[PDB]
Design a binder for this molecule. Structure first.
Ligand SMILES: C[N+](C)(C)CCCC(=O)O
Ligand SMILES: C[N+](C)(C)CCCC(=O)O
Ligand SMILES: C[N+](C)(C)CCCC(=O)O
Ligand SMILES: C[N+](C)(C)CCCC(=O)O
Ligand SMILES: C[N+](C)(C)CCCC(=O)O
Ligand SMILES: C[N+](C)(C)CCCC(=O)O
Ligand SMILES: C[N+](C)(C)CCCC(=O)O
Ligand SMILES: C[N+](C)(C)CCCC(=O)O
Ligand SMILES: [Br-]
Ligand SMILES: [Br-]
Ligand SMILES: [Br-]
Ligand SMILES: [Br-]
Ligand SMILES: [Br-]
Ligand SMILES: [Br-]
Ligand SMILES: [Mn+2]
Ligand SMILES: [Mn+2]
Ligand SMILES: [Mn+2]
Ligand SMILES: [Mn+2]
Ligand SMILES: [Mn+2]
Ligand SMILES: [Mn+2]
Ligand SMILES: [Mn+2]
Ligand SMILES: [Mn+2]
Lengths: 131, 131, 131, 131, 131, 131, 131, 131
C-alpha cells in the first residue's frame, strides 16, 4: 500500500505545445507495470484549453470544479460541469478546457499504450474556441 | 464523446458480502473495450468497511471526502484524507473504509482483467478494524 | 487561529423530526460570538429530504456532491447540482434533499438569531416530493 | 429560492494590493440584508498568498483542494489540507495562501460589518513566507 | 369492427431527428377519414426524450409504465406517473420523456390537421432536460 | 408498511451473460427473510431474449405488455401476450424474450433457494430463436 | 498503612509544555525513598496528547476509560482500549493521548531516576498525531 | 445482538443550557422501543455541575470515577464516590456534578416518557454550589 499524501506532488505548468493559455497540472498517479492507467488533475484558467489531441486507449474526464468546454472533431462544443463524466474513444480527436469566463478542473484518467498516454496535434484556434 | 451527466447514474447499496456496515456505491465509468479501466465513488458510513479483497491489476484510491482508514495484509492501519492517493498492487490483499466515527468517500479506479475488477475475501473483523 | 483538522469532527445522524429518510450531518463550524454564522455538510441518501423549515437569517447551500432536489413553499421542485449555490430568504419555508435515486451532499451555511439557526415544520410528504 | 448555477458567476483575478502572486477569486454568495454573510472560493497558485489582513467579524476557511499555508501574527506557519476548517478571530491579523510547490483552494466565509468584509494591510514578505 | 391483435404491429426505433436517446415507438392506430385521431405507445429509455415539438390540435398523453418528465416551453419540468393524463394545447411547444434513471411508456393520442399530427422543432438540451 | 414509490427504483441494463440483445430490468421487490420471493419487471427489445436458464424453486411470468416468445427445453416456442401467466417448474430449462419485431415486458416472480434465484446456462442461438 | 481516600487529591490541568490540547492530571501516588515508583491518572480530551517524551526507567500505561492512541517514534500509531497494558522502554521516545473524537483516561506508572520520572521533548504535530 | 465497540461513540460537549462549567457526555445506549431506558457516561471537570432539573421517570446514577457532589431541592449537598449508586425519584428536582477540586464521572440511567428523559431548570448558583 503506497499513499501519496495531499501536497506531496508538486504542481506543474501546462506546456505551451499542449495548451493554449494558462493551465496547471497536478499529478495524481501513474500505475506501475503491468497496470496501464494514469491520472492527473488539470486546472484550466478562463479561456485556456488543450490542443487537439487523441488518446490511444481513450480517456475519461471527471469534472471536479468550475465549468468547462469540450469538443470532439465534427461535434458541438459542450459545456461540462462538476460530477459530469466524459468519455473519449480511442483515437477520437478532441479538446477540453475552461469556458471563456470560468476556470475548470477535471481529473483526466487514461490507459497508456506502450507508455504513451496522448498524441498531441494542432492548437484549438480562437475561431474553434466558441459556442 | 459521451457525457454521463451528474445525476444520471443511480446510487446503489453496498452488498453485504462486500462490506461490513452501510456503504453506497455511485458508479462513474466503465470504459468500453479495448479500454479496461473502471471507476466508482464509494461512500462509507462511520465504522463501515470493505471485506478483505484484491484487484487483479491493482487499484488507485483518491479520497474525496471525510476521513477513512485502510490496511494491507500484514501492515498497519493507516488514515487516509481528502486528496490522498492510495495504490494497492495487483493481488495485494487489503481493505478500506470509514474511520470509526467519521464517514469517508473515495474514488476507486481499477482496470479489469477478463472483465473482473475485484476478488472478494473474508470480512474485516472488529478486532482487525483497529489501529 | 483555530484549525479543526479533517476527521476531528464526528459524523452524526439526522434526527427523525428533521428529516424523512437517512441523512448524515458532518459539522464544520459554529463561529463564536460576536460572529453568528455556522455551517455543516449534509449528506442525503436517495429519497431522503429535510422537513419543511425556515431559517431566521436565511440560508446558503453550496452543493458539493451528487444530485439533489429543493423547493420553496408554492414553487416548483428544482434540481441542484455540484457547484450550484442556493439562497433561501429569512422566513422562507423550504426543503432540500436527495433526488429519488441519487444521493446529494451540500454545505449549509446559516447565521443564527438568538442562537437559533432553523425552525422545523411538517415533513415533506411523498406527494410533495415530486416535480 | 435563488439558484446561481455552476458557471454563472465569472472568475476574477486577485488584485495586486490584496495578494502576492497569481490568485483567482470565484464569487459564491453575498447574502442580502439583513443577513451579513458572504463567501467566495479562492484559488492560490503555488507561491501565492494574501497580504496580511483582518476581518471585523472573523473568518472561516474551508480548504477544498490542494495544500496551503496560513499564519496569524505571532504564530507558526501551518499547513492546511482539504477538509480542514480554519477560524480567524475578529481583528486577528493573518494571511493564507498556497504552499510554495502546490496550489490551494479554499472557501472563505465571513460576516460583513457595515458591508465591510476585510481590512487589508501589508504584504507577506518572502522572509515571512516560509516554514 | 377491425381488430389489430397485440403483437401484429411491429415496433420501430425513434428517429434521431425526433428524439434524444433511445426510444421505441409501438404504433396503435390511425383512424381513417373523416376521423382525425391517431395513437401510439412510446417507450423512452432513461434520459431519453422527444425533441421540442407542437401538435396542431393538441395532444393527450396517458402514462402507462415507469416514471417520466414533461415540460411546456416556459414552464417547469413536471413528473408524470402511470395513470396520469397530460394535455398539451394546440400549438403548445413541449417535450416529454423518461426521467434520468427510470424508463417511461406513454400512450400518445393526437388529431391530425392537413394530414399532419406533429411539427418537430429543435432538440431538448441537457441543460433544458434537467432544469 | 413500506412503500416504494413509482420512480424510486432505478432501471438497470440486462447483463450480456444473462441476455442476448438489449434488455432492461426494473426491480420491484425482494422480500426480506423469512420470505423468499422476489419480483422484477423485465422489458425485452425486439429480438432480445434470456439465455437458457433454470430457477431452483420455479418461476411465474405475468406478461404485462407487448408480445413475446418462450420455450422450455424439448418444447415448442410459444407466443405469449399481456395477461398470460406462465409457470416454469423447478429446474426446468427454458428461455423467454421479445418476439423478433415486437418488445415484451413481463413481471418475473421467483423464490430464492440459498439466496439464489436463477442458474444461468448457454445463450439461445439464432437457430433456436425461431417459430 | 497510608490511605489517600478518593477525592482527597486535587486534579490539575496539564501544562502547555507537556501536552497539546486539554488534559487533566489526577495524582495518585509517589512512593518515598527507597521506592522509586509513582503513578497518576491522566484524562485526555478528544484530540489531546502528550508531547514527545521519554522515561528514564520506562513506563507502564493501564487504560481505564475511553479510547486513545499511542506511538513510539519510528513506529505506527496504535489504538489503546480500557484494560490494555502498554510498556515503553527506558529512554523510548513516545507519546500517548486521546483519539481524535473520543476521550481516554490511563493510569501512568513510572519509576524515577535521580528524582526525575520524565524528559519532555517537542510537541506532537497534527501531522504526526494522525499518520 | 448489537455491539457498539469501544471508541465507536464519539464524545460530545455538555450544552451551556444544561451545565455550568465544562462537561463531556459519552453516550452509551438508547434502547429502541418498546424499551424506554437510555444511559450515558458524564464527566464533570472540577467545579462543573448540571443545572437544576428533573426526570419524568426518575434517574439512577452510578459513580464510576473521581468524587463529586449532588443535591435534591431542600436537601443537603452530599459527596458521592465510585461505586455509590444514587436514585432520584420522578419529578425530584436535583443537581449533580464534580466537587470543586476533583472531576467526577457517573453513568446516568433514565427512562424516557414521551421520548423526553429530562426537564431542565435554573442553573446551580455559586452560592448553592457549596458544602
Ligand atoms: C496529459 N495530461 C493528462 C497531463 C493532460 C491532458 C488532459 C486532457 O486530455 O484533457
Ligand atoms: C469495485 N468497487 C469499486 C465497486 C468497490 C471497491 C471499493 C474499494 O476497492 O475500496
Ligand atoms: C441546520 N443543519 C445545517 C444542521 C441542517 C439544515 C439542512 C438544510 O437546511 O438543508
Ligand atoms: C476577500 N476575499 C474573500 C475575496 C478574499 C479573501 C480570502 C481570505 O481571507 O483568505
Ligand atoms: C410522433 N408520435 C406521435 C408518433 C410520437 C410523439 C410522442 C409525443 O408527442 O410525446
Ligand atoms: C433474474 N431476473 C428476474 C432479474 C430476470 C429473469 C427473467 C426471466 O427469468 O425470464
Ligand atoms: C508526567 N506524568 C507522569 C504526570 C504524566 C505523563 C503521562 C504519560 O507519560 O502518558
Ligand atoms: C441527560 N444526560 C444523560 C445527557 C445528562 C444528565 C446527567 C444527569 O442527570 O446528572
Ligand atoms: Br441526463
Ligand atoms: Br485532530
Ligand atoms: Br447542454
Ligand atoms: Br398458439
Ligand atoms: Br502539522
Ligand atoms: Br457523608
Ligand atoms: Mn484529452
Ligand atoms: Mn480495494
Ligand atoms: Mn434549509
Ligand atoms: Mn483571511
Ligand atoms: Mn407531444
Ligand atoms: Mn426464467
Ligand atoms: Mn509516557
Ligand atoms: Mn439528573
Amino acid at each position: 500500500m503506497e499513499i501519496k499524501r495531499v501536497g506531496s506532488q508538486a504542481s506543474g505548468k501546462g506546456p505551451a505545445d499542449w495548451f493554449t493559455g494558462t493551465v496547471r497540472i497536478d499529478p495524481l498517479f501513474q500505475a506501475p507495470d503491468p497496470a496501464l492507467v494514469a491520472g492527473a488533475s488539470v486546472t484550466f484558467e478562463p479561456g485556456a484549453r488543450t490542443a487537439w489531441h487523441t488518446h490511444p486507449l481513450g480517456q475519461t474526464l471527471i469534472v471536479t470544479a468550475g465549468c468547462g468546454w469540450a469538443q470532439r472533431e465534427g461535434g458541438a462544443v459542450e459545456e461540462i460541469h462538476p460530477g459530469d463524466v466524459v468519455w473519449f474513444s480511442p483515437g477520437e480527436k478532441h479538446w477540453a478546457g475552461a469556458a471563456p469566463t470560468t476556470a475548470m478542473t477535471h481529473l483526466a484518467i487514461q490507459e497508456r499504450l506502450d507508455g504513451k498516454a496522448v498524441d498531441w496535434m494542432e492548437h484549438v484556434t480562437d475561431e474553434q474556441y466558441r459556442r
